Design a protein around this ligand. Structure first.
Ligand SMILES: *[C@@H]1O[C@H](CO[C@@H]2O[C@@H](C)[C@@H](O)[C@@H](O)[C@@H]2O)[C@@H](O[C@@H]2O[C@H](CO)[C@@H](O)[C@H](O)[C@H]2NC(C)=O)[C@H](O[C@H]2O[C@@H](C)[C@@H](O)[C@@H](O)[C@@H]2O)[C@H]1NC(C)=O
Ligand SMILES: *[C@@H]1O[C@H](CO)[C@@H](O)[C@H](O)[C@H]1NC(C)=O
Ligand SMILES: *[C@@H]1O[C@H](CO)[C@@H](O)[C@H](O)[C@H]1NC(C)=O
Ligand SMILES: [Ca+2]
Length: 317
């Protein structure tokens, strides 16, 4: 059908930025990011993908410290979190209007994933996390329409933590990669549908892809507990073939390696093809985005160190 058989690069008064990601409308793609100062408060800004982030090129959206954004074919849905603890909240804008809010249920802070949310046939889906401790975190999928919350589903994530969710959609399934900041150096995976049925699975190989992490181990569908605490946003293309991604080694954030696994992420993890990128550059967060115009496209963004996003897109059938 539409196997991803490789990846190619597609993009290579300054505002200081963190938690950036990419999202696209029908013609163009944007960097959404949290601006926290000037190369001489915290607010979601947006900039055309070809430009540097600067007061002249970047557009302020709303105050906040995490975010998500997605285009539904008609208008932008944007979410930001702000406030603290039990008074932490998320606000949502649809086009130019603020359309909804909700507050923390489990002690806060409310946290958005800092990757694009996923719109399918006018509904948009976003993962929201809550809870003050990574060892007792709560995660919900919120379904939106026109920037208004229609419903949500809290997930059973007992025994894991699922932060920094980065998601894509193929064939009206939505698939997200999580970062476990508590007790796993492998990345938890989420699969869900427009009806909010879902499955959470663990990679069954022996090569953890979080940073920090331990060394390689025997393949199994067990969690990789060694150096499981902490983590950084990243992605796994959860298809057949699957593709994993990680720093070159567990000792350094240099480099970025992509590995193709034809039998999928729940198999023993035999690699058929690998890439090595950015060999002597420090790399950071990574996540999915999907441009909008046969097979559905999938791309990824990656922080590189002065710290900028590069983007790569998948080549299909
Ligand atoms: C809530 O989920 C937990 C853990 O489920 C496992 O990890 C999840 C993140 C997800 O990936 C699931 O697909 C995984 O199974 C589950 O507890 C686990 O249940 C399995 C058996 O179904 C056990 O083998 C496993 O030891 C257990 N893990 C832990 C950490 O407790 C919960 O289901 C269950 O509660 C436990 C205490 C058992 O009594 C079990 O019979 C009961 O169904 C699940 N809670 C609910 C209400 O479904
Ligand atoms: C959860 O982690 C926190 C932070 O380190 C710790 O204070 C607490 O004891 C842990 N709680 C449980 C249930 O183990
Ligand atoms: C969303 O706006 C559309 C216009 O595209 C309208 O037809 C629809 O009823 C709205 N849906 C909700 C849930 O408000
Ligand atoms: Ca981890």
């Amino acid at each position: 059908m539409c196997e991803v058989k490789g990846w190619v690069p597609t993009h290579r008064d300054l505002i200081l930025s963190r938690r950036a990601y990419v999202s696209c409308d029908l013609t163009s793609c944007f960097k959404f990011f949290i601006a926290y100062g000037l190369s001489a408060e915290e607010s979601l800004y947006k900039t055309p993908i070809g430009s540097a982030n600067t007061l002249s090129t970047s557009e302020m959206i709303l105050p906040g410290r995490s975010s998500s954004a997605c285009f539904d074919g008609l208008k932008w849905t944007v979410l930001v979190s702000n406030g603290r603890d039990r008074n932490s909240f998320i606000m949502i804008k649809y086009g130019e209007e603020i359309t909804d809010t909700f507050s923390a249920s489990r002690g806060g802070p409310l946290r958005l994933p800092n990757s694009e949310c996923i719109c399918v046939e006018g509904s948009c889906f976003v993962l929201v996390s809550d809870g003050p401790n990574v060892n007792q975190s709560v995660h919900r999928i919120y379904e939106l329409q026109n920037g208004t919350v229609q419903r949500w589903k809290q997930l059973n994530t007992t025994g894991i933590n699922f932060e920094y969710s980065t998601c894509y959609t193929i064939n009206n399934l939505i698939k997200c990669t999580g970062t476990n900041l508590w007790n796993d150096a492998k990345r938890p995976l989420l699969r869900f549908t427009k009806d909010l049925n879902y499955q959470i699975v663990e990679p069954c190989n022996g090569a953890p892809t979080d940073f920090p992490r331990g060394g390689l181990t025997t393949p199994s569908c067990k969690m990789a507990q060694e150096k499981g605490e902490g983590g950084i946003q990243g992605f796994i293309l959860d298809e057949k073939p699957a593709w994993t991604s990680k720093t070159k080694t567990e000792l350094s954030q240099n480099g970025f390696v992509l590995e193709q696994i034809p039998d999928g992420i729940e198999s023993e993890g035999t690699v058929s093809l690998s890439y090595e990128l950015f060999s002597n550059k420090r790399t950071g967060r990574s996540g999915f985005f999907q441009p909008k115009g046969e097979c559905q496209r999938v791309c990824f963004w990656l922080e590189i160190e002065i710290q900028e996003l590069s983007t790569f897109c998948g080549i299909n059938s």
